[PDB]
Design a protein around this ligand. Structure first.
Ligand SMILES: OC[C@H]1O[C@H](OC[C@H]2O[C@@H](O)[C@H](O)[C@@H](O)[C@@H]2O)[C@H](O)[C@@H](O)[C@@H]1O
Ligand SMILES: [Ca+2]
Ligand SMILES: [Ca+2]
Ligand SMILES: [Ca+2]
Ligand SMILES: [Ca+2]
Length: 922
């Protein structure tokens, strides 16, 4: 065998485009048409030509071959690479212990290329099955405890035990299982509560070095402050459970599709909820336990929302996030002295705000004073707040540190197991006292960091290049998610995800999960996870969002269309965009030009828009389709009088309706990301639309969601006309811009120009529309909350609003005021319960009519003449505070609706089922 040598820098190892996908297959474009193709390896050293310019390291001979069908299906995106075969006698385990490098040279031996090797594929093929059959983490049983961590490429792994004061009390070399590649150590039950970390000795391809470092348990179920050490815990311990925990039941059913359809979500954040509530005990503000302060404005508010129809609370990241320091002395919040901020934040101390350091004001008081002179030319509020955000307690938390441990900063005591009971106490309070189910936001699509050096890199330190998705040529961790893209298509990560969800389900009694960027997950993986969880809780609900994956080349993604008929819900952006207007990418003038159905598209144009009546009627089509569950097979009459199925209604080049059942669709017009509903209406509302009209626009926008068949979802505060002062992405904009005032003084609008880094290009349009009308005050907030509760109350007032089954929707739901002769902005939906619909689902009525007049004109409906239509008792009871205030039902049967109004009419059921409102044949 000729000796590979350099030509007798540009000939040294470069890139990492070689892929060791299975025991005997290596896919690499470098050895193509090359005479000498080898796979060099070194246990403890780095391959490199010796001084003699020769690569005198051990290797295996690679022979050209064709990619098998097994590898082709597993990695479609690699099926194109030149395939190479390894001898069937090579010691895979031995080579995986160190560095492997693919080298190609000419017949004469001179090197032509050398590259690092990606081994995730061979890792699964070799150890996955065996490793999948085992359980991980610090498992505390009756006989004692068993620690287990998967580290198939590590040369050494030691279990390091620490005392409460964090002194090493023992370092145990673990036992490696040859079949699985997992390491374990069994001890006595006295290790309960002990802190620990795994001391790793493993080769990391990014640094090309056998690293030595201690890492927390990715299966950690308890942690020390700021997640520095994992901790042994038995979640079953009654000491970690609030009184009566085991008997906690779901206040709302989620068994049948009809049950699921009634879901009405309120997306909340732990600090957003209580950070500003002075009626919440000071020590609980921004904490899980704030939910237990029954006499506070916040809790009382949520209680009333629940009583009125809100069924679920969805929590932004409450798993262990990385972007908030849990050591209180390293943190400074706006309610504290500016002097504290200067001592914990050196950036502030060296800024133009340094002069406030020895002042006697709180940061909050300083921010308040900076408001008067704040403008697009002097955005001083955000300037100061941007420095504040670096060391405060605020962050949405979409930055996974540990997937199966509650976040520590939201606990009154972040050290050890304490947070576990506090978290459960909150869950119990929400379900038992507030009467709402709980949904958790999960972020398995990425990790906070990767590599062998970052503090928050956990998974990529233990099994390098396995848990992260890498670029096919460079080996670099991709960041399409934002951060460190994970690899759910890899078996052991899929298992980690499922095992994690099992704990949140069983041990924390979470009722549902919302997957962040779910389309970055293989459809097969999401479904497998659901199958495993349904075994634990048959009624658990899974849903997610995203819509910009780009991973189709690697596997079938969990997208809106691919999930059709699976029962997995997905946020629908169809009705969202049609009602809000425009899209998430809009900036500058487009923000004002792109009005939506909820802001007067076509019927009440602002001075910049160019929207045509046809474009406005198209949005109405998307809106009606959404109110009917955004079904692919739902039949309606479009803006041109044409008979169309939901899938035929275009949505920016994609088929609008995609679902099989309304329970697979989550409608919404506001969410944590992107501008709040109120800020969008402020950007879009015509100058002449007065304050009272804008409040009704907010209610009308929300009416399309609440009175629709899809699952209803809304952002915490929409009922309060919540504003973020135009901030589009407020994930790190602190308490200041994310403020929700449960004392009802204002909606946090106009409290300074938003962050310049992200909204700077919008300062011009903001200054132009910001002061159009007055800032909502207590009168407006109370009026909106009333409108909001009226809507949620109407949604649960009849099972006809939440049919659940797609076929049933098609059999009962229809629309009026459609076609080319339609009155723009008037949405009229009928729901049948008459003889022709089948069984009577509502003993009180034979049918319901939902009329939403999103227009500055009064509209008269003649469709139901002689039908004896009556206004809903719920709206009648609201009198002139109703969204239906002013509605009139004449003697003949015609109905007149005032501008910007919403009316729910009904056909009182007689002695027997009546004619109802049969769906018209099309
Ligand atoms: O902290 C990281 C990241 O958090 C926030 O984004 C989270 C996800 O938000 C979705 O709306 C978006 O589609 C995804 O791509 C994001 O991962 C925050 O908005 C962002 O600025 C931060 O980088
Ligand atoms: Ca944390
Ligand atoms: Ca912050
Ligand atoms: Ca890609
Ligand atoms: Ca009936």
């Amino acid at each position: 065998d000729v000796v590979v040598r350099l030509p007798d820098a540009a000939f040294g190892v470069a890139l990492a485009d070689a892929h060791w996908v299975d025991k005997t297959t290596l896919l690499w474009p470098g050895g193509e048409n090359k005479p000498i193709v080898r796979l060099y390896y070194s246990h403890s050293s780095k391959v490199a030509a010796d001084s003699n310019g020769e690569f005198s390291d051990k290797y295996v001979k690679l022979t050209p071959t064709t990619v098998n069908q097994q590898v082709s299906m597993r990695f479609p995106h690699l099926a194109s690479y030149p395939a190479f075969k390894l001898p069937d006698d090579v010691n895979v385990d031995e080579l995986l212990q160190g560095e492997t490098v693919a080298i190609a040279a000419e017949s004469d031996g001179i090197l032509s290329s050398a590259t690092q090797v990606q081994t995730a594929g061979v890792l699964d093929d070799t150890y996955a099955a065996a490793a999948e059959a085992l359980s991980y983490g610090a498992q505390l049983t009756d006989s004692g405890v068993t620690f287990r961590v998967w580290a198939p490429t590590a040369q050494q792994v030691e279990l390091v035990i620490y005392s409460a004061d964090k002194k090493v009390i023992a370092s145990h070399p673990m036992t490696r299982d040859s079949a699985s590649g997992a390491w374990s150590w069994q001890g006595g039950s006295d290790l309960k509560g002990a802190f620990y970390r795994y001391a790793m000795t493993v080769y990391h391809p990014q640094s090309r070095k056998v690293e030595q470092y201690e890492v927390t348990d990715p299966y950690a179920h308890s942690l020390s402050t700021n997640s520095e050490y994992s901790q042994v815990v038995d979640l079953n311990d009654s000491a970690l459970k609030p009184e009566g925990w085991d008997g906690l039941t779901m206040p709302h059913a989620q068994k049948t599709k009809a049950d699921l359809a009634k879901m009405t979500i309120h997306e909340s954040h732990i600090r957003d909820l209580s950070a500003w509530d002075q009626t919440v005990p000071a020590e609980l503000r921004g904490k899980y336990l704030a939910l237990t302060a029954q006499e506070s404005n916040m809790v009382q508010h949520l209680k009333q929302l629940s009583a009125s129809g809100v069924t679920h609370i969805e929590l932004l990241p409450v798993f262990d996030l990385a972007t908030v320091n849990e050591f209180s002395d390293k943190v400074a919040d706006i309610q504290q002295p500016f002097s504290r901020l200067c001592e914990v934040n050196s950036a502030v101390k060296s800024s133009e705000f340094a002069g406030y350091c020895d002042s006697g004001s709180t940061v909050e008081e300083v921010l308040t004073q900076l408001k008067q002179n704040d403008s697009k030319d002097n955005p001083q509020v955000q300037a100061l707040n941007t420095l504040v955000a670096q060391t405060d307690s605020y962050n949405w938390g979409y930055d996974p540190f540990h997937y199966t441990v509650p976040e520590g900063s939201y606990a009154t005591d972040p050290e050890g197991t304490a947070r576990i009971k506090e978290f459960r106490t909150m869950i119990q309070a929400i379900k038992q006292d507030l009467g709402m189910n709980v949904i958790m936001d999960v972020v398995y699509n990425h990790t906070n960091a990767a590599g062998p050096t970052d503090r928050t890199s956990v998974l990529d330190k233990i099994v390098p290049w396995y848990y992260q998705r890498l670029n096919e040529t460079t080996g670099s961790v991709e960041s399409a998610t934002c951060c460190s893209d994970s690899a759910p298509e890899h078996r052991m990560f899929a298992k980690l995800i499922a095992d994690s969800l099992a704990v949140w389900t069983t041990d924390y009694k979470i009722d549902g999960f919302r997957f962040d960027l779910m389309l970055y997950h293989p459809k097969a993986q999401i479904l497998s996870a659901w199958e495993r969880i349904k075994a634990l809780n048959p009624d658990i609900y899974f849903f997610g969002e995203g819509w910009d994956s780009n991973q189709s080349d690697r596997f079938e993604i969990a997208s809106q269309i691919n999930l059709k008929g699976t029962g997995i819900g997905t946020f629908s952006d169809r009705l969202r965009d049609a009602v809000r207007g425009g899209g998430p990418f809009d900036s500058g003038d487009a923000l004002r030009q792109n009005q939506g159905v909820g802001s007067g598209a076509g019927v009440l144009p602002n001075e910049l828009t160019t929207l045509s009546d046809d474009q406005a009627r198209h949005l109405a089509d998307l809106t009606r389709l959404g109110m009917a569950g955004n079904l692919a097979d739902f039949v309606l009459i479009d803006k041109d009088g044409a008979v169309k199925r939901g899938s035929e209604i275009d949505y920016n080049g994609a088929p609008g309706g995609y679902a099989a059942d309304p329970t697979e669709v989550v409608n919404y017009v506001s969410k944590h990301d992107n501008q709040t509903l109120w800020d969008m209406i402020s950007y879009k509302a015509a100058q002449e639309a007065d304050l009272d009209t804008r409040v009704r626009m907010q209610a009308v926008s929300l009416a399309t969601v609440m009175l629709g068949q899809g699952i209803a979802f809304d952002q915490q505060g929409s009922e309060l006309l919540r504003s973020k002062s135009f901030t589009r992405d407020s994930y790190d904009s602190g308490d200041w811009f994310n403020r929700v005032d449960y004392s009802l003084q204002d909606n946090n609008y106009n409290v300074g120009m938003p962050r310049s880094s992200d909204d700077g290009s919008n300062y011009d349009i903001i200054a132009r529309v910001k002061d159009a009308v007055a800032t909502p005050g207590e009168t407006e907030l109370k009026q909106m909350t009333a409108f909001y509760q009226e809507l949620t109350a109407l949604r649960k007032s009849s099972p006809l609003f939440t049919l659940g089954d797609g076929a049933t929707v098609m059999k009962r739901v229809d629309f009026r005021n459609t076609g080319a002769d339609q009155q723009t902005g008037l949405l009229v939906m009928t729901i049948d319960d008459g003889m022709q619909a089948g069984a009577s689902l509502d003993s009180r009525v034979d049918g319901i009519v939902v009329a939403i007049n999103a227009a500055p004109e009064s509209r008269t409906l003649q469709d139901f003449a002689g039908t004896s239509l009556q206004l809903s008792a719920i709206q009648q009871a609201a009198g002139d505070r109703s969204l239906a205030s002013g509605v009139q039902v004449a003697a003949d049967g015609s109905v007149t609706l005032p501008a910007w109004s919403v009316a729910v009419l009904e056909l009182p059921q007689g002695e027997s089922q009546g004619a109802g409102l049969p769906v018209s044949s099309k």
